[PDB]
């Protein structure tokens, strides 16, 4: 049995589906059993890391777990995993842990505080460490739906966005094929792209020009305070200013693990085109 936590999510849903396709018994962690909103063949379970007694029942007879970095409860998970006889944990982490002075960064520190307890536990592990998720572009969907323009603080800020399906394929490979125990994979998409480049690629999927223009930082800060705590807004804008005009690193890891080219953001945009139009 494999437990896929967050089995309703972008990545977890695809992992669980692909595992059922291979004829494997899959448990899917969900918020509510009346739902469950999961692929055919996945057994819905509560796997709430803030209630470790739910974890104990979720892990009964489970061989392997796909885990997403919970903000709370990793020590409780490690305990119950050990006691249940789990042999392999695949963790969705972040490429931030690989950067210099990752302790000095909040995002880096958050992910390190989940990796380290797993690393020190005695459990078999694989870490999957993506850069920016392509799915972050869905945040522009409401704006793109109504306009020919996305306004942002840093149109020139680079990321290397990774398609969720590639992440899911790497996770599935780590769970079902040999050579991934104690491996930590840094995943990027095949191209480093500016925000403005990404917007234009969504325009291409839609078949119409979508521009990306600079807005003053204070305006951008105000709007972002509509979505986030003022502290987090400050950190977002600092990260974007640092990546402004700075191509991010492109890694070959997806191809090296899966044997298939990494999916492009152009491909991503086409796959998700329905989100961007009426």
Numbering used by the authors: 2 to 279
Paper quotes:
SimC7, which belongs to the short-chain dehydrogenase/reductase (SDR) superfamily, catalyzes reduction of the C-7 carbonyl of the angucyclinone, and the resulting hydroxyl is essential for antibiotic activity. SimC7 is made up of two domains, the larger of which is the nucleotide binding domain that adopts a Rossmann fold; the smaller substrate binding domain, characteristic of the so-called extended SDR subfamily (Kavanagh et al., 2008), is mainly α-helical and is largely formed by two insertions in the nucleotide binding domain (between β6 and α6, and between β9 and α10).
To investigate this possibility, we determined the structures of SimC7 alone (apo; 1.6 Å resolution), the binary complex with NADP+ (1.95 Å), and the ternary complex with both NADP+ and 7-oxo-SD8 (1.2 Å). Overall the apo, binary, and ternary SimC7 structures are very similar, with the notable exception of the lid motif, which displays a number of different conformations.
